[PDB]
């Protein structure tokens, strides 16, 4: 998962001579639009927990 | 068992590997004389260019 | 399956009609010109045995180790070993069907296992590639094996006997006899006779045209759709 | 495979059937005009052995220190090594098949531990230039290293013996007849023997071409796209 | 690669069959008309030698200081210095390949330092102009310098000698023969001998047009973009 | 760089070959139609150095004070200096190589300070016109000047001595026999000849369409976009 | 190097070949001179 | 992975011997370790080679 | 081990940095006179172009 | 500059050749006048 993640290892794009090796990141760019969404309730508190 | 290498290369290869073996026998058979016995004239025609000394059993 | 003696006759009535060998009785072939005819005749099936798949057969191959390139050639079989120039036999023959040395195009060859071995095939391990038409490189002798080899073949050899049967089509007779008049009156060099020669060539096309047209010969071919369920495709 | 000997005999019935040279039996050529006949049938083999790939042979040659132009020649061969012509012997070739100095074009040449190197690719070391097409240039003769050279073959010299067999598929041997005539018919420079040429020659593309038409030759090619699995495309 | 003994021999049976100066032998040519033939072989190696990349070669070109012209002949070479026409040899050849005049066209020229220097390039200092197609003119002849000149190549002169070793492609040969027919049947003013000069000159484009239309020659080129990677282009 | 006694022998065995001053060794032209044979020689250069830019030479022209047009004759020259017909030479050679009247064409003319002057502009200042095609017409003769005036060239012309050398690219004779043959052929006026003159101009279109299409005199021209730089775009 | 093991044992086949010929040719005489270790020579032990 | 090519290219014909050589590796290391064991004649030429023999020699027999 | 400015060259540039002390070897053998034994004619005929004295040993 | 190395090896390849033949040719003769020196002599010191 993280090797899709961020387009290295067994994603990495074979780089032959003449050809392109560009892949463009489609999980990163996923996961990056539900980082944000997923911190901000943690953080829009002054006190994180209720009791 | 079918050998992945090739099974004439298995065997070539073992033959290979074997040579000093072989190479210190032809050694001795070449430096060493060596006297052999033979049946007839047909026999004694037919024996290897290292072959010095013989001797025919009539 | 007529015989040459009778392909004799019927080629002395229609195209041979006019030929010098022609005989007193009109209904044989002298003597002289039988090696001319003869030499005409296999060509002629060659040529039809060639464009029309009219032949198919498949002799298997024993496997002999430190051997890959496998000739498909008579010396090398086992009814008709050549000790002078074959060191052992290797295609198998029964003595009433012995090879013919008669392969014209190598179709599909499979295994002593049932395995189907790709031809002509780059990057395939378990692939034969035929270096010449008539051989054949296992690059893998295996133990045990063996390789039925279906080709196309052309006609066994007529050596000259007047006994020997011919298999062709009897559709394709009126083929043969317009072949082996063009190859008879283009040699005699003459205005006349090379005219006459390009019309019985002609007619040779036309009458395989026609059997192309009708398929008479089996050229047509249909098979099940078996790529369909293993690509998916439910 | 057919021999020499048969060549003469069946060429001398259907081609060469007006020539001046057929002997009273009609079934061989006089002894006068065989150097030309001969002469015409290594023509006639080479121009077949050009169009199709017919005879694809692989000569190894070794790599000796300081030499970086590898002619393909018969003098540097070991079997046939010229002392007078060549410095060392460094192709390698078996007695039972010597090296016949027959390669018409360089196809795909390995090395000795497997890497295929590209032929004339400008920006590529590890790769064997040629320039001229019986030679090869590596620019870098590393130590232990041989190379198997895939190359188009044409048939090997026919010397005059009557006992040399000939590797021709027998469905072309129609069209080697039609191009022997071609050759003969065309240097008689009458007005008679020149319209003859022309027609034999003309049949000897219609024949070539049939050959071409249904795959007599093996000339259709297939491969696994093993491409595609390298581009990437999961 | 034939010998022009074998070449005069294949010459009298093919193409000048029905020619005058045909020996008694009907194998060789009379030694009357050998010039004339000797003549039509020499012109025909140059334009095959022409059409097609036959023979590229490279001949390393010293720089002497003062000298910016540098023709490529053979009076300016080492081993052909010719004192009473070149001041100083700046060519470099050795005995056993000396400099044999044949540059066709100066195809890429590198330095002693590995550096590429452009040909006919009006806006580039480090740029070699050829004034004239044997010549070459570098505008600064640098210290320790010299230029390995890739250029297309013709066939070394035939000065006569029936031991000389023809270097033609063994496909290309039924090329040759039907231009020295041409050139000789075409000079006898002749009306049958005219029209015969049209049909062998004809074939010899159509052998030259199979020849380039399976890439028996080497005319196909493929090479490495590498240009891509420098545009940027990641 | 062959010599015009080998001219002779070359024509005289393939175009001049049924020409009636072939002299009786066949290797040689009569003494009686050389002049006429150099005479088309000449012309046979001239056109082949017309169409192709096969020598491009340049000879420097110093201004004299009071004069503006400057004709590039020989009689004007340093070396070859006539003083019944030059009032001052102003034209620079060197004894080795002196002006041999060979313009055709004059293409690009610089100055003894390196500055490019435009030719045939007329709103152009520091333009040189060129009133008919061998003069040129400086407008401005300024002090200490001078014009290194590239120039297609014609082959200098050949005086009759059997001893000068040609230069002409070997792959270009098979054009110029080609012409010499129409320009001898043409003129006796007989319908035999008549038609062999335009089968003998019609190859030599031919041979230079062939030397045109391949790039074998150098007729490709590329060159670095320096425009693109100077019109702005960054 | 697959080539140069086939070609190191292809450049001594002929020694090969005599070695081998040499072993089924066998037939070296054997000095005994007693009977006792004459019957206690090898089945291959022709000539004495 | 098979190397078999290589070997028809090579010792094709020839691999008869190669493969009785092969069968026969005991009985050539068999014949080597009597042959040590000097339990035979050895023919010499000459009396002058007969000191150049090992310590392990048991007969000989000189020509002439 | 293969070098990689080419296998032939290393040995060329080899030479070519001891030229100097062949140098010294070849001036010693050229101004020195040498006198060198011959076994027979044949060998005495091919003899270098700096010997200047020679002795057939018969 | 490999051009220089290869020419500078190249124009006294035939000096060259005639040290290596000097070199098998090696027959100078050495004056020992004494035994002792003399069975002192090297390998390959023919002649004295």
């Given at each position: 998962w993280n090797d899709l993640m961020k387009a290295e290892g067994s994603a990495k794009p074979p780089k032959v001579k003449g050809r392109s090796q560009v892949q463009p990141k489609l999980v990163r760019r996923q996961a990056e639009w539900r980082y944000a969404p997923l911190s901000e309730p943690f953080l829009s508190s002054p006190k994180l927990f209720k009791l | 068992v079918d050998k992945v290498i090739g099974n004439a290369y298995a065997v070539v290869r073992?033959?290979?590997?074997?040579?000093?073996?072989?190479?210190?026998?032809?050694?001795?058979?070449?430096?060493?004389?060596?006297?052999?016995?033979?049946?007839?004239?047909?026999?004694?025609?037919?024996?290897?260019?290292?072959?010095?000394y013989a001797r025919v059993y009539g | 399956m007529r015989k040459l003696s009778d392909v004799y006759k019927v080629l002395a009535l229609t195209s041979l009609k006019s030929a010098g060998f022609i005989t007193d009785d009109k209904v044989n072939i002298e003597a002289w010109g039988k090696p001319e005819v003869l030499a005409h005749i296999n060509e002629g099936l060659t040529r039809l045995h060639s464009r029309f798949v009219l032949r198919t057969n498949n002799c298997i191959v024993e496997m002999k180790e430190g051997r890959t390139d496998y000739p498909l050639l008579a010396r090398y079989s086992y009814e008709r070993f050549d000790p002078a120039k074959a060191p052992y036999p290797y295609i198998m023959d029964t003595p009433q069907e012995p090879f013919?040395?008669?392969?014209?195009?190598?179709?599909?060859?499979?295994?002593?296992?049932?395995?189907?071995?790709?031809?002509?095939?780059?990057?395939?391990?378990?692939?034969?590639?035929?270096?010449?038409?008539?051989?054949?490189?296992?690059?893998?002798?295996?133990?045990?094996?063996?390789?039925?080899?279906l080709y196309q073949a052309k006609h066994p050899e007529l050596t000259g006997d007047e006994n020997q049967e011919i298999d062709l089509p009897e559709t394709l007779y009126s083929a043969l006899e317009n072949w082996v008049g063009?190859?008879?009156?283009?040699?005699?060099?003459?205005?006349?006779?090379?005219?006459?020669?390009?019309?019985?060539?002609?007619?040779y096309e036309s009458i395989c045209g026609e059997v192309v047209d009708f398929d008479l010969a089996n050229g047509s071919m249909s098979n099940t759709n078996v790529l369909f369920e293993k690509r998916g495709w439910v």
């Amino acid at each position: 998962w993280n090797d899709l993640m961020k387009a290295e290892g067994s994603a990495k794009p074979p780089k032959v001579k003449g050809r392109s090796q560009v892949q463009p990141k489609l999980v990163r760019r996923q996961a990056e639009w539900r980082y944000a969404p997923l911190s901000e309730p943690f953080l829009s508190s002054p006190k994180l927990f209720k009791l | 068992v079918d050998k992945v290498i090739g099974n004439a290369y298995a065997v070539v290869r073992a033959v290979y590997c074997n040579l000093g073996n072989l190479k210190l026998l032809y050694d001795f058979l070449n430096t060493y004389g060596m006297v052999l016995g033979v049946k007839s004239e047909a026999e004694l025609k037919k024996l290897n260019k290292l072959a010095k000394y013989a001797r025919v059993y009539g | 399956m007529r015989k040459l003696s009778d392909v004799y006759k019927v080629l002395a009535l229609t195209s041979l009609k006019s030929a010098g060998f022609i005989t007193d009785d009109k209904v044989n072939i002298e003597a002289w010109g039988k090696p001319e005819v003869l030499a005409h005749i296999n060509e002629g099936l060659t040529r039809l045995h060639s464009r029309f798949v009219l032949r198919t057969n498949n002799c298997i191959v024993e496997m002999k180790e430190g051997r890959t390139d496998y000739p498909l050639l008579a010396r090398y079989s086992y009814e008709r070993f050549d000790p002078a120039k074959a060191p052992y036999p290797y295609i198998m023959d029964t003595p009433q069907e012995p090879f013919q040395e008669d392969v014209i195009k190598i179709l599909n060859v499979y295994d002593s296992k049932g395995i189907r071995r790709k031809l002509n095939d780059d990057h395939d391990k378990n692939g034969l590639f035929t270096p010449r038409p008539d051989v054949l490189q296992c690059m893998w002798p295996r133990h045990f094996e063996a390789l039925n080899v279906l080709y196309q073949a052309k006609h066994p050899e007529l050596t000259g006997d007047e006994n020997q049967e011919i298999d062709l089509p009897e559709t394709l007779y009126s083929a043969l006899e317009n072949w082996v008049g063009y190859r008879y009156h283009t040699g005699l060099n003459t205005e006349g006779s090379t005219a006459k020669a390009a019309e019985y060539l002609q007619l040779y096309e036309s009458i395989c045209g026609e059997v192309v047209d009708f398929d008479l010969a089996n050229g047509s071919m249909s098979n099940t759709n078996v790529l369909f369920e293993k690509r998916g495709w439910v």
